[PDB]
Symmetry: D2
Subunit: 234 residues, 4 copies
C-alpha cells in the first residue's frame, strides 16, 4: 500500500487534523474558508496536521504524489484579490513575518531565496503592476519555486462563483508537476506542467495545505475549498 | 473501499487479465502495442480490454459511477507524420471489433453515423485528419470526446510530440457529469486539456469493458501506438 | 498503488464480473448463493470466480504476491446439522469444475489423492465430517487449509453457528509464506483462527482465478452457503 | 476513497509523523522501540502516536467509523519471562501520558478504576499477570480488550513466543460494533483470536489519536516491546 492517502469529502468546524493559521477556518456549511468572510484584509493557511516524507536521504528515493480539490472564488464586484495556493513547505511551517496577501502568506519578500523551501501552485486573481510587479498581465495559474515570481504561468480563465475541480500530479521519475483545472459548469479548462526536483528544493519532511489572501477589503472575494484528496508514495 | 482499482506499472507478454483483439499484443520489453510493429510494416487494427466487466451504473439504485484513469503512451512515427491514432474507451461488456471497421474509426465503429446502439464513449488521440478519408475530423491532430460516433462532440488541438512519452489523466465525476482529459509531455512541458458533459447512464449499459484501441490505415505512414502503463479506478 | 483491489458490498443478479459455475447464482436480495436454495431442496455444487485472472507470482522477477481478502457468509441449516461446506480458493486461471467431482470435495477435486497437478489452494469451512463418506476429515466441523488435496494440511475446530453471519479475513504474507484465517461471529463473539505455511510459487501457476465453491451432497441434510460481501487485494 | 490510510513498512529515526512520548523512539535498524532498550536495563514507559488526529465518529450525521490496522511486533525477554506488555490504543486527540501512571497500566491509566472520563479503548498484549501488583489480571499472559480500565472486559490466553515476530490484524466493524483481534506467529503457526462488542460513540470523543504504548516495570525482568511495521485505515 501507499505511504499516505487521505480524503475529505467535506470539512467540519474545528477539524482536529487540519492546522489553521491566520484567518483560516471552516464554516458551519462544511467549507474551508482559507480567507475570512464577513469585510476585511485577510491572510490564512490550513495544513494537514501530520508531516509527510517527500524524499528519503537514506535511499535517495523521491515521492510521487497526487492531489485533488474543488474550490470556489466568489467576488462581490466583477474582480477580486488576491488568490489561493496549494503548497508544500517545511514541516510545521508558520506564516512568515511581514508576509502580505499578494504572497499568500508564503513569502516575506519577492526575492528567490533557496532557504524558503517552498513549492506552490497559485491561482492568482490579482496581477496589478502597482503591488505585484512580478505577475503577468492576466489572472493566472503559476508554479512557484522558492519565490512568488512563478517559474511558469498560464492564463487562468477564472469564473466568478463557479466551482473548479483541480488535479495536481507529481511524477517523481520524470520530475513532472502537472496542474489540471476544469469548470464542470461550462467546460472551461486550463492546464500547466513544469519540471521540479523536490529533492533539490524541499527538506525530507514537509507539510501540505492551502493558503490565500485578500489584500484590499474593497475588492473582496472568497477563497473556499470544498473537498480535498491527497496521496503520496516513496 | 472503492468498487474497483487496478494498476499495471508494466505489461507482460500474454497477460491473462487483458483481452487482446485484432493485432494488439505486448512486447518482450513490457509495452502494450495496440497496433502491430513489424518492419515490413502493415495496415493494423487492435484493441486491449481489461478482462473483467465493470458496473458503470446501477439500475436498481440509479447510482452512476465516478472513475479515474491514468496511462502513459508513445506514438512514434517513421516520417514526420503518421496514422491513425489511439483511443481509450468504454463499450458494452466483452464487445468485439465491429465488422467492416477501419483504422480511422479505431476499431470502434462500423460507420460514421451516430447510432445510439453503438453504446460507445471514447477519448481519441487522432493523428490523421485528412479530409479525403476522415471528413468528420477538424484540420489538425486532436484529442476528441467521442459519444456513439467517430465525429467527436468536442475536440481540442493536440500538440503531438513524435516519439515522446505522454502522461494522461482522465476523470469522470458522476455528480456533475464531467469528463476531463489531462495530457502532458514531461520532456518539454507541453500540455493539452479538454472537458465535456456526458451522462454515462444515457449512453452506456450497466456493464462495460474498458480499454485501448488504435489503428494504422496506411502502412506507408506508419507510427506506433504503445501504452506503457495503466491505472484505473471506478466507484458507485 | 496495489496491483488489484475490488470490493462488493452486495451482489447483483447476473453480475458480469463474476463467473458462475454449476448451481452458483445471486438472488434478488443481493446475496451470492454458491449452493442452490430451491422449493424442493436438492443435491448441489457451485463455484463463483472473479472474472479476471490474477498474477499471484512472476517468473521473470521471482516475486510472489501478498494478498488479503474479507467476506461475510451465512450457513443456515434446516435441521440442527447440514452438509457439506463452503470454500475460498485459488486455482489455475479460468479453471472449470472437474469431472466426477462431489459436494464433499467442494467442486475442487476429482478424487482424494494429493496430485501436484491439481494446483489448488483453498480454505474450507467444512460442515460434514462423516467418517464413512469423508474419511479424510477430523471428528468435528472445521476450518481447513487445503493444498492440492481435500485432506487438509492443518485444521482447527470450527464453532459453527446456525444461521448466524460470520466475518472472515484471510491474509497471505509472501515474505513469511504465512496464510492466516481469521473468523468471527459478531452476534456472540465466537472466534476461530488458523495459520499455516504455504509457498504459492511452489503450488500455483503464475495466473490464477479466485472465488468461492461449495456443495450439498445430501438434500435431506440441506443448508445454505451464502456469501454476503467480498473484498480482495493482491500485490506483487 | 477512504478517509484515512497510512502504511509504514519500516520506521526512521526521529520520524516527524509519529509523536513520541516517554521513552519511545525508533532505532537505527528502523524499528519502533516503544520501551527503552539499553546496555544496563531500566524501568520504562513509552507511547508513540500518529501525528494527526482521526475522526472516529461524527456528531452531525451520527456516523461511526470502521477501521482496520495491521502491525508486526516482537517481545524479546532476557530470561524466560518479562514485563510488562504492549498495547494498541485509541485515546482523546493529542493525549499525554497520565500523571502517576505505571508500566502495568501501559502509560494509559492513572489508576485501576473504571472512569468514563478516561475515554480509552486499547488492545493489550499483557506479559505480566502477577497477582501482587496486577490483581486485575487473569492467571496467564493474555490479549485483552480494555475499555476505560486496565481491567479488560474480555481476555484470551496469549501463547507468547519469546523473540518471535507476531503479525496482528485488528478490525472494527461499525455496523455490528465488533472489534476482532487476530494474532499469529508465522514461525510455528501459533494463533490467538478474540472478539468483543464495543460502541466507539459511547466511549470515545469524535477526535482521537491512535498508537502504541508499553512498559517495563521491573528492570530485572526486562523484555523489548518493538513494533516492526504498521498499517492503518479508517472510514466514516
Ligand atoms: C501590505 C499589503 O497588504 N499589501 C497588499 C498586497 O499584498 C496585495 O497584493 C494588494 C492587492 O490586493 O493589496 C495590498 O494591500
Ligand atoms: C477502409 C480503410 O482502411 N480506410 C482507411 C481509413 O480508416 C484511414 O483513416 C485512412 C488514413 O490512414 O486510410 C484509409 O485506408
Ligand atoms: C458422490 C457424492 O455425491 N458424494 C457426496 C459427498 O461428496 C458428500 O461429502 C456427502 C455428504 O453430504 O454426500 C455424498 O453423497
Ligand atoms: C521573512 O520571514 C522570515 C521567517 O519568518 C524572517 O526571518 C524574516 O526576518 C522575514 N523578513 C522580515 C522583514 O521580517
Ligand atoms: C457494423 O458493425 C455491427 C456490429 O458488428 C454489424 O452488425 C454491422 O453489420 C456492421 N456493418 C455495418 C455496415 O453496419
Ligand atoms: C478428475 O478431473 C480431471 C479434470 O477434469 C479429469 O481429467 C479426470 O479424468 C477426473 N477424474 C475422473 C475419475 O473423472
Ligand atoms: C490520573 O491521570 C489524570 C489524567 O491525566 C489526572 O487528571 C489525574 O490527576 C491523575 N491522578 C493522579 C493521582 O495524579
Ligand atoms: Ca498576485
Ligand atoms: Ca482520424
Ligand atoms: Ca467434509
Ligand atoms: Ca499486566
Ligand atoms: Mn502570480
Ligand atoms: Mn477525430
Ligand atoms: Mn475437511
Ligand atoms: Mn491485563
Amino acid at each position: 500500500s501507499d505511504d499516505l492517502s487521505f480524503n475529505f469529502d467535506k470539512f467540519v468546524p474545528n477539524q482536529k487534523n487540519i492546522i489553521f493559521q491566520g484567518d483560516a477556518s471552516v464554516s458551519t456549511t462544511g467549507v474551508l474558508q482559507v480567507t475570512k468572510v464577513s469585510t476585511t484584509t485577510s491572510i490564512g493557511r490550513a495544513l494537514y496536521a501530520a508531516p509527510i516524507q517527500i524524499w528519503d536521504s537514506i535511499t535517495g528515493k523521491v515521492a510521487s504524489f497526487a492531489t485533488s480539490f474543488s474550490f470556489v472564488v466568489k467576488a462581490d464586484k466583477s474582480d477580486g484579490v488576491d488568490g489561493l495556493a496549494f503548497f508544500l513547505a517545511p514541516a510545521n511551517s508558520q506564516i512568515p513575518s511581514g508576509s502580505s496577501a499578494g504572497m499568500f502568506g508564503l513569502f516575506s519578500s519577492s526575492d528567490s531565496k533557496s532557504s524558503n523551501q517552498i513549492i506552490a501552485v497559485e491561482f492568482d486573481t490579482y496581477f496589478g503592476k502597482a503591488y505585484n510587479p512580478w505577475d503577468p498581465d492576466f489572472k493566472h495559474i503559476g508554479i512557484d519555486v522558492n519565490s512568488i515570481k512563478s517559474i511558469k504561468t498560464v492564463k487562468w480563465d477564472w469564473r466568478n462563483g463557479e466551482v473548479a475541480d483541480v488535479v495536481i500530479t507529481y511524477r517523481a521519475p520524470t520530475k513532472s508537476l502537472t496542474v489540471c483545472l476544469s469548470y464542470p459548469s461550462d467546460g472551461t479548462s486550463n492546464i500547466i506542467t513544469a519540471s521540479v526536483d523536490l529533492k533539490a528544493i524541499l527538506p525530507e519532511w514537509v507539510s501540505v495545505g492551502f493558503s490565500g489572501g485578500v489584500g484590499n477589503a474593497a475588492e473582496f472575494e472568497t477563497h473556499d475549498v470544498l473537498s480535498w484528496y491527497f496521496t503520496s508514495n516513496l
